[PDB]
Structure formats: C-alpha cells, structure tokens
Amino acid sequence: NYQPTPEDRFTFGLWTVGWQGRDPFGDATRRALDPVESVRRLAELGAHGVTFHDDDLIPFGSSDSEREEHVKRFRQALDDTGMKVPMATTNLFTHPVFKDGGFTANDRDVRRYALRKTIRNIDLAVELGAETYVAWGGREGAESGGAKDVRDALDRMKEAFDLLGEYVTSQGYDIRFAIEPKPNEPRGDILLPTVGHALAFIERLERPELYGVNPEVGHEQMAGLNFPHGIAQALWAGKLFHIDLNGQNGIKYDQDLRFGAGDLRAAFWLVDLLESAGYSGPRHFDFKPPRTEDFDGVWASAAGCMRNYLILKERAAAFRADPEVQEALRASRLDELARPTAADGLQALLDDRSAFEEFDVDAAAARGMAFERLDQLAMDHLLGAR
Amino acid sequence: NYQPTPEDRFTFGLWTVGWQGRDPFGDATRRALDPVESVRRLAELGAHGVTFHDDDLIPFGSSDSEREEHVKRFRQALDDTGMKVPMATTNLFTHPVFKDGGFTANDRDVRRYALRKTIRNIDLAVELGAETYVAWGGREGAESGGAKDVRDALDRMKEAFDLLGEYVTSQGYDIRFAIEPKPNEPRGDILLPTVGHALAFIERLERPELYGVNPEVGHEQMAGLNFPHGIAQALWAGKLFHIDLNGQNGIKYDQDLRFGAGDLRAAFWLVDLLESAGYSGPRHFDFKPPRTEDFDGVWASAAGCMRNYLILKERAAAFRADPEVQEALRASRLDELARPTAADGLQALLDDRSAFEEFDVDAAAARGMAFERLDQLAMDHLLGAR
Amino acid sequence: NYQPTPEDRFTFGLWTVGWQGRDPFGDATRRALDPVESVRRLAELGAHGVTFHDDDLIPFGSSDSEREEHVKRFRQALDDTGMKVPMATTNLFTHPVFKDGGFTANDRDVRRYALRKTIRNIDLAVELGAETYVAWGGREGAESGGAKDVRDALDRMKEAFDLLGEYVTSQGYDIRFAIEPKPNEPRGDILLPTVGHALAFIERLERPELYGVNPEVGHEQMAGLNFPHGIAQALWAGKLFHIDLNGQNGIKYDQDLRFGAGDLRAAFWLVDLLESAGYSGPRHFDFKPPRTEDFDGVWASAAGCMRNYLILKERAAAFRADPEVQEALRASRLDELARPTAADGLQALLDDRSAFEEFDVDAAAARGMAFERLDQLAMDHLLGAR
Amino acid sequence: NYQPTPEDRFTFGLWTVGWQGRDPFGDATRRALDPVESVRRLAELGAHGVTFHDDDLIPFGSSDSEREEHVKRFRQALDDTGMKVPMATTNLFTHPVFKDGGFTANDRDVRRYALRKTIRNIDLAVELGAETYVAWGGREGAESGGAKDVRDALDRMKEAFDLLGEYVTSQGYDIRFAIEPKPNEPRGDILLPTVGHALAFIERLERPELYGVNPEVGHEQMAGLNFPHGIAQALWAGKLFHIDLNGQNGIKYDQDLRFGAGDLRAAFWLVDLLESAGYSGPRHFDFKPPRTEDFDGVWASAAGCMRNYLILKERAAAFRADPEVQEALRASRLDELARPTAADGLQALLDDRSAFEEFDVDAAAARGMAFERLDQLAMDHLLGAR
Ligand SMILES: OC[C@H]1O[C@@H](O)[C@H](O)[C@@H](O)[C@@H]1O
Ligand SMILES: OC[C@H]1O[C@@H](O)[C@H](O)[C@@H](O)[C@@H]1O
Ligand SMILES: OC[C@H]1O[C@@H](O)[C@H](O)[C@@H](O)[C@@H]1O
Ligand SMILES: OC[C@H]1O[C@@H](O)[C@H](O)[C@@H](O)[C@@H]1O
Ligand SMILES: [Mg+2]
C-alpha cells in the first residue's frame, strides 16, 4: 500500500539521510554515509533522484585526482540504480570564510570567491544533468542592525545572480536558478526571508525568467505564514521551479521533520494544490532524521516522507472528486471567485446601478459562506471518515 | 525639547486617536470623537496632517446632504489649522458585507461593490488633496484551506487594482496606490502577508509604477521579520510610497502601540534608515491609545509618537556622524560592501586566480568582522552613554 | 457514523455558538441568540451540557425581576432537554470598569466589586448545579512595564482566590475553582500566562486542593507550547479540573477554531492522553463559528467539534491496541521509561559500577530510539492507512 | 564610565566566551580557549566569577591524573585573579548517549549514568565553592508525541531531583539546585518549558526549599512571554536562586545575544525589577559572541554585557527616584495596587454596599489609568531625554 515509484518524482539531498546528527548542543550520533550507499538505499525505497551540495559529493579541498574519483564512483551508482540528479546547490555556509555571507559578505574577496565556488559546481551539476541550481543564502543576513546595509547587500546579491545568469547564458546551459528563502537561522535575520521577498527580488534581476523560487515547507512556517498560500503566489507568478518538502511545528528553530509531520493539515492543502496545479518538478525532501535514530531509522524516516505524500495525494483527490464537495464548493461560491469581476469594463461598472446605488448590502451580508461544512468535509476526507 | 513641527511631516489617522477602545473581549472605554476636534488637538501637538477611511469621515450610509456637511465641517478644520490630508483609504472590512473580503470576496457582486466604494472615495481624497491612496486587504484571506483558491483570488486582486489604476488614469489624477501588507488578523491568513509578497504582486500589475507599499512596523513584526530590512528592500525597489509607524511586542495579535514602544532598537534602525535614505513621504502613525486611557491619555500617546521619532532621529544622526563609528564602519568593511563585486566582468572573474586558485581561504576566515564593537557603539549612542 | 451522545460529556459555552461575530475590525454578522434556543439546538446535536458567564445568561444590569425570569426560562430549557450545566464563570472583562483588570485592577474599589460580581454568580452556578467555577483573568496584565507591579498584582490575585475559597467553604458548597491561563490578548501580557504559571500560583494559595487549571488548546499554542505536554503536567499534578477544546494555527491572535482544526496531530495526541489517563470531566468546547457563517454554519461548526473528537478517540484507541504499536513501544523502551530509575536507593546507585565506572557509553549511544517508525505508525492510524 | 567591579557580581560561563562558533550549519570560527586565559581576561574586564559545565573544565573521558591537573591549573587562575566560582552544572546534552535525554532518557541505564555524572561534579563544584548547582534538561523532551509519556518522564525527573537532594543532604553540603527552563531546542519540545512549569514541578519535589529556578532572558522570550513578569513570579515564590542574562529577538532559535541586545526595553524593566527587589545572587551572562567575531570581539562582547547592565541600572534608578515619576505612579494608582483588597474580611466585603449595590461602575470606568504618560516617562529616562 501507498508505495512510491521513480515516476512519483521523489528526490532527496545527500545531506538529508546523510546528516550525522550534530546539532548546536550535540555531537554526531551517526557515522558518515558514502554518497554511493545513499543512492542505493534510496533507490531501493522507490526514490527518483538525489541532489547535492558541492561539498556533499567532493569533500572540501579535494585534489583534482580525488575529485575525478568521487564523481566516477557517484556516476556509477546512478547508472546502477537509474537514479537521477535533478538539482544541485553550492555550500556557501559551512566553511568559516562564509561567516558573514557568500554573495553578500562585506569582504569583497569573499564574494568573488563565492561566485567562483558556485560557477565551478554549476559545470559539475550540468554534467550530472541537473535542471535546477539552488541558492540558499543562509549566511546572507546579520545579527545586528549596523553590520549590513541591506540596500547595499541587495546590490551585491543582484550582481551575483546577474553574473551567474550571464555564465549559464555564455555556456548554452539549460539550467535555471531557484532561490530558497529562509527568514532566520543561522543569521539573526536572513535576506529574502520569504517566498514573497524572493519573488520581488527576481523581478529586479537582469534576466528574470532564468530564476524562480525553491520554497521549503518549514521556512515559511518559521515566520507563521501559510505555506500553500505562498506556493499559490509562486505558481500564480509562474516561478515554482522546485520545492522542498518537510515538516515544522510552528515558529521555532528549523526542525526539518519528515514530510507530513508537523502541520499535517497544511501538508494536505499543499499536496492538493501541487496536484491540481499540475506541478511537474521534483518532489524534493529536505529533512533530517532526528539524531535519536540509527541507520535503520534514517531509512524508515525517508520512507515515511514518500508514503505521507502518497496518502495525502489520495485523500485530496478523493476530496476534489466527491460530488458532495463539488456541491459544497458551489455553495461557498468558489465558482464565483474564478469568474472575472468586471469583464464588462470600468465604464460598465461605473454605470451598473446594481453595484452601488441599488446594491442590497444587507441581503448580501446575510448570506453565509458555508465554510465550516466545506472544511469539515475536507477533514473527513483527510481522516477517511466519509 | 524634541518638539515636533508640521515640517516634520507627522500624520495620524482619524481612526487612531479616534479609537473608542472596543477590542475582541471589551466594550468602548471612550466616547466617539468629532473628526474636527481631532484635527485641532493634533494640530496643537505639532502634527502635519491627518488621514481617513471613507467611513471615519462620512458615517456609513449617509445621505448626500449629510455627506456634503461632513466634508464642509472637515475642510474648515484643515483651513483653521493648516493641517493637510496626505493619504486616504477605503474601509472594506467593518461592514458585514465584507466578511469574506472586498476585492477578493467569493461573491462577485461584493467585489464589484467594493470597487465602487473605493472609487467613490478616491474622488473625495483627491479633492482633499491626498497624494497616496492606501489599500489594506484585511478581509482578503481565509480561515480554512478550501474556502479560497488563492490563485483565483490573486486574479481577482489583480483585476481590482488594474481597474483602479485605469480609473485614476482616466481622470488625470496624480494619486498613487500603496498596498498595506498584514500576515493575519482578522482573517486566519491574509493575502499578500508581507512587504515582499506585496512587492511581488505589484510587478504583475498592468501599470506597476502606479503602485507601491505602505508597510506597518507591527505587521512585519507579527511574522517575526526585521522591519528595517523590509523597508530596505522597499526602498531598493523604489516602492516606499508611504509608511505606518507604531510598536509591537513580537508575534501576537496586532497591538498598534505608540511608535517607539515594543521593539525599541528596531525603531532606532528604522529611523536611521528612513533618514539616511532620504525618505520624504509622511511619517504616519497608525496606533491605538490603549483602552485604559481617557481623552487626556490619548493625546499624551500621540505626543509620545512624535517625540520618540525625534529622539531616535537625533541619536541615529549622532551615530552616523561620530568619527569613532565611521572608523568602526571601515573596520567592519561596510565600505567594501558598497563596492561592486566584479566591475571587471565575468571573464576577468573567471581568470582572476586570486579569486579561487590562490585565495587564502583560511586567512580571510580568520578576520573578525568586529560587529560587536560596532553594535555596542550604536547602543551607546541610542542610550546617550558616549 | 461518529455520533455524539450526552454520555460523551460534550459541553459548550453560551458565548461560543452565541458569538455575534464582532471582531477588532468588524461588526456583528449574526443576530443574538436566546440562550434557550442554544440549549435546544445543542441538545439536538448530542451535547451533554452548557456553560455560561453571568452576563451571557442575565444581561448586565438586569433588575431582580428580570433576573428571576431569565433563570426561569433557562431552567425550563434544561428540563426540556436533559442538558446539564457543569461549569460557570464570571465576566470580568467586557464592561469598561475592568479595563485594568478585575481581581488585580489597580483601583482597589474595582477589585472589591469584581469579587462581589463573582460571589453573586457562584451562588447562581451552584443552584444550576455547576461543579467547577472558572476564572479567566483576561484583563489581569499590562501593556507597558510600569503600569503593574507584578509581585503586588500576585498578592492581590492570591487574596481574591483565598477569599473565594473562604466563601464556598463558608457556604458548604462542593464547587471547585479552575484557573484558565492565557499568555496575551486582550492585555499585552496576561498574568499566569501558561498552565505551568497557573499550577505554580495555586501552590501558594491558602487551600490549594480547592483549585485546579482549565487549560485551553489555543492558549498554550499562542505561546508555541505543546498542549498535550501541558495537560500531562496538569494530570501529573492532579489539577485537571476542566478543559477547553478548540483549534489554533500557531502563534497569532486567539482564533478559537472548532476543535480538530488548526493543529490536527496535536489534537490526536491530546485525545489519546485524555482517554488513556481516564479524564472524566466535561469535554468543553470554547470556540467561535467564524463570522463568515450564518446560523446554519454555527451548528455545523459545533457538530464538527464533537465528531472530530470521536474520530480521534477511535484512531488513538486503535493506535494503543495495535500489537505492532505495542511491539514498537517496547522497541523505543517506553516500558523502561515507566520503570523507576533507582528503586535500589542512592547508596546502591553510588556503588553500582555498571552505572559509571563500567558503563559502556558508546554502546548505549549507538542504540537507535526507533522513534520514526513509532511515529509513522501513529500517523498511519490517524489517517486510516494501516 | 559605567565600569564594572567584582562587587557588581558579574559572572560568565566558560562555555560563553569559550564558544568556538560551531552552529547547525557551520564549522568553528575560533580556536578553543584554555579556561585559564578566560579567567584572566574576564578578571581584567571587571568580572566577579566564572561558571562551568563539568566537561568545560575537565575534557570528557579524562584520566584521574589529568583531572587533577586541570583543576590544579584552574584553581591557580582563580587565586591569581580573585575570581569566584558561584555556580556549576552538568553537561547532560553533548555526548550522543544523551540523545533521548539525561534524567528522563527512556533507557534506564542512561538515567542512572546521568545521575552519577551529576553527583561526581557536585562534589567538584562544592570544592570550588559554588553555591548553586544548575540543571538544564535540554535533552529532556521529544520530537514526536509517542516517544515520551510525559507523566512517566515527570516521575523520572522527580526521582532524579529527589535523589540529588538526598545526596547533598547526606553530605552536609550547602549547595542548592536551580532548574533552567527552556521551551524547545535541541528537542522539539522540552519538559518544564517555562519558569512557571519549573516552579510547579518544584512544589511536587520531596524537599522543595532545596530547589529554585535559573531563568534565562532568551528562553522565556522563545515562547513570546514577558521575562520581567516571569521573574516577578519567581521572586514572589522566593525561588530566584540564579539568573541568566542575555538577549533575544523574539520567537526563533536560541540566539544568546549579549545582554541588552534584542529586546532593549524588557532588559530595562528586568534590571529595574532585580534592583528594586534586592536580588543578591550572581548576575550571570549566558551568551555567545557571534561567530563573526575573532578573539578581540569576544571580549568586547563580554564587556558590552556588563556595561549595558550598568547603564540600565542607572536609568532605572533615576526612573524610580524622579518625583515626576512618583507623582505619575500615584496617578496610575500603583500605590493602591499594593494595598490589600479586603483587609476588612469576607463578611465586611459581603456587607459593604459600596462594593456592589452602590458602586458607581460608570464613574470608575471613566477614570483613565494614565499609563501612557507613565510609560513615556520611563522611555525618557531610558534614553536620557528628561
Ligand atoms: O543550499 C541548499 C540547502 O542547503 C541545506 O544545507 C539546507 O539545509 C537547506 O535549507 C537548503 O535547501
Ligand atoms: O485601511 C487602512 C488601515 O485600516 C485600519 O483600520 C487598520 O488599522 C490599518 O492597518 C490600515 O492602515
Ligand atoms: O471566562 C471564561 C471564558 O471567557 C471567555 O469569554 C473566553 O473566550 C474564554 O477564554 C474563557 O474560557
Ligand atoms: O547546563 C546549563 C547551561 O548549558 C548551556 O550549554 C546552555 O547554553 C545554557 O542554556 C545552560 O545555562
Ligand atoms: Mg532547503
């Protein structure tokens, strides 16, 4: 039951099932994982592909010879399994050089170096066939107000992304960029903190169509926001290039629980939205098996991500196909929300006496929206109590 | 000391000092205020102008005759004082007809009516000389996931604003629009919840240059975000048309404390940003004298808003002019953040061996940012302990 | 399916289904409800009883004659239905006199009056047979630091509750008190903000066994806390006298969604705890039909509360009875958590070399907790996907 | 100006200025510190003492010989400086064995080992002369609902603390215990999440007077709570044995900013409370120099903690001594809040017709509290603008 297949487009970062369990207050609870074993275990689970930071695949500071061998070993695991690599990203946050950021570090020479680090790995990711390159500016921010002139840092951020788009244009690459928002942690406040802030920033870029967003369930929930609403604006803007699925209990540190844990109802509305909008990119999981777990629990965790997606997919589809729900949807006038407000034109609106002079405001106000019956119907479908 | 003058551009809504003190769990603690007395008391305090919702000035459902008289009385108060009216807005939230929203209500006929209500008041606001019309979509949202298809609601929101911009274009008006974001309350989640989400939405509008944002200190703080950072992206985008100043203690209900209360340090960084960016619009206060206060406390509260702005203005200016702070700013390389990252070009960057092959990563990582000394200098200036 | 019966002990406040829909920014969307019709509609729904504030039942300032008639009418509705009245409370928050609090108002004469208001209604509630009197100090708090010396206000709070316990002792009443915590709203910060703070305060009271807590799902979630954990400490302390069930989306204004909405998984762990601990008090719903709803939606909302409780009751019972879950519970050593740590005594512990000198720390650290398989089993039961 | 002296009772953990800068997403930015150099640098800064976890002072797994030498070296640094050691604590969170907790780990043998680890270090701390032993149960909690029966875990927590109090009683020690609350991180939810929850738990202990709380500014602010209010209830309960001073920007990860950063106004109300209550324990700083800083910035950070305390001490004292503020305090009836509510007795209250039958509710409701003038006076004192 609810079994994933590579057609379901499930992918994982190497850093997810690979997380050794070091937290702010704790040491590692698990040994490191060869990227090769992760590709195989995930393939066995029904995964479609894997993603990586540059330093997850080639250990930082590796020699050219070792780099070649680390890729050779990795390529052979994908060949053996059929695994894909749909996305890659640069680690511009772990090494101490990035302590004040990467593309927006105050030191100019750190910013130039962060660009060379990203450009090197774009080459690699294109070779492995990734279609999306992700940027997570987790060190772009500040803990105190005077350490970062934000308008200046946005200037620098725009130059970094403009230059990156100039590079892939100059190489003929098909890869596109996806910014991953996060409101805080590790910096006290991170720049482009939400899906909205990232969409707005893309529109000031030189070639905007080259960039989209990679929202993560938990990051919007770290700011108390509605994740499906944010996804809806990303899809409305045509900029859902990639997505990160996980779970989060409200406003606290970045938990990265397996998908479906945390806010279960919001996961349901998310899957219903992705499916009904026909989202076709990877269903990528960016989670951390809690450091209480041994290797066996790591894989049960990753298996739980895909299962919970498949369960929610079925419930949400049953929801939208139920004729009682379709009748309730008409009752709540969801059909009327899809109709244009004034297809007749401004002038027609200005003269339509039934829109002001003769609008029975009290009659309209007395019409219930019937939202509770609709929502209780959604809950019954979620829980299988119809 | 720290005394405001109309040149300081301080303005107030009628609804602020006019708030009778009805909260979710409480009845009014103060009688209603004639808009005329508010104009006079505020003028006495050194205010520059007032703003209004349509229904703050003309009681809802007033006859044409009464409407004329309510304006006549108001115009005479501004003449008597020199008060201005720099901004107005529509009340699309109080009357029960707007319970599911205004421009995005599911019922089409409510949306058409909300447009006629706004268009009527734009006329009025232009007559009183407002330069900015504000939209706060406080009822645009939902409490449950199925009651609002967000992509549909954004379609409707785009039509409403496109139509409004078509109207002021057709009339030759100079007025511009400013969207006021809010993440939640009264709806469970509000659409365009943050400054970012509002900037992104404006870029999909038909004539974007006609629209900007009207951020409110407390609304971004309701989502745990850094208000000065948000303002910085608005100014970077050129869309700070208007601003709402108040105070807020973190993530909870919308408090609307007088400006300077709540997060005092963020108020300092905000004033420093507005001043150094040369923000020239009104310094508008959108606050609520706590319902514990009588009329005398209402005016002490409004007086505290302007005073706290003036105090912070002085401290922040002393901060940026102190040569020790200018030396610290160089120490933390804030000057280097303002320099372009690769004015030399992509190709020069790709060949600059000092940016990768010969970058001493460990030397750069070992250079402290000196952010703490800088911040302690800012604190000393704030508190007057230099 | 999942149909409630009065044996299920479901109760409602008059103020819940009675809420006219006035919010901070909106007018009423529904007419007022005669308490009699609410008793009948709720009875029809399978409810067990109703609760009331004094002013929900007798309008504030009623004459003795009218008071008698309002009770006569109410008593006859309970007789006609079999409805009970298991709990009552005082409204010490709506009238403007309570703007600085009730039992802790700065004005002494307001505090004395709040005590007389409560004592009058205790008499009434005992007559209607309530077994619990609830105190919600929603106005006990402050918006600014200097307006309330907290240690003084706790002195006053202790005197109010000591006096109340002296009264019911002097009358021979069986009724007990339950404090209802809330962290904020309407005050900027409320005293005794959490279940913990309320438990601690009770232990300083003169006759502590007379007082317990009445936690509300949403109020602990307004402070980002785990509601089942809080309930567990209340039950561990023996002070779960009453409970308020509803739903809440994280840290924001007090939403009072119907039970089961908001955090669905936490509702599941709550019902599992209440049932397995054998909680026997009323299952009281303190919710607000969203003001989008007409009268029909009000009753669908209240019906959804009981249904969602019954659904969760079944899933959680199926969870604890599943032998796979019982095997997983042993795997995660939940049985070992119930065993005493050192039944052998301090001295035996101090000499047990297998507890320090010869403890294989690395072997123990390498044992996974298997928490993910356990949790995925709980999720499968919740969703009916076993 | 504002210079600390050992009489000011300022102390620091070794782990604070000793923090190498490893965060969830980053490697160390600073070398490790010999505890000896920290004692000397802090002494030079005007600190009074240092605190330590067992593993900050003796590296985990040290041989008896090395242990002796690490203490010998440490004792000589305190002798050379006059530094004291007023508090110590056990590290029951870093080693992987504690991944499911210490005193409440599901594995019994981990709990026994955690007790032996604590008891060993109590001996040591008494030798160095600490007067308070702190317990921070940062691993006592859970990420999912089924992994920890909370009532069971409280049973285990009560046994651990009862046993610890049995030990210090059996040894004649004077040391007392202080529980340090935290709502979350590293566990998804931590047991005893707030000051309140910790006070309530102490009252169920065998010898409660042996235990108090060690609240930390940032931990209560992680749950949106008012830190001075929490301190006020701790002092009202007589259980402020110790305190941790730092700074925190609202509800997010545990930031541990230097004291005075984050919520500046709440720091002011805190210092005013500690001083006016005559708190006499150590003023302990539990902060992290941001990993952007080199060694020089570490010490500027620690210096900023004490300075900001001294500045706030002066402003708050000037506040309480200003006769205008004393007149305002009477205006807001803070004097009346300190008076008993019914010193005359229940019966006198029941017969006092001026408390109900003849209470002019409308007159009392119309009296403003004058809280805004009072608060603006407090702000003027904070900023030095009187
Ligand atoms: O760089 C991209 C990724 O970096 C990871 O280390 C973070 O955990 C993710 O939030 C992000 O998706
Ligand atoms: O409509 C604009 C205004 O409406 C007011 O009632 C709200 O309090 C403000 O948030 C908003 O600025
Ligand atoms: O007084 C007790 C009750 O008062 C109601 O008005 C509030 O909504 C509840 O939080 C509380 O249970
Ligand atoms: O164990 C006591 C201490 O442990 C430290 O590592 C934490 O950072 C503090 O929150 C706590 O005061
Ligand atoms: Mg991610």
Ligand SMILES: [Mg+2]
């Ligand atoms: Mg506003």
Ligand SMILES: [Mg+2]
């Ligand atoms: Mg309640």
Ligand SMILES: [Mg+2]
């Ligand atoms: Mg601490």
Ligand SMILES: [Mn+2]
């Ligand atoms: Mn994350």
Ligand SMILES: [Mn+2]
């Ligand atoms: Mn507001």
Ligand SMILES: [Mn+2]
């Ligand atoms: Mn509530």
Ligand SMILES: [Mn+2]
């Ligand atoms: Mn901390």
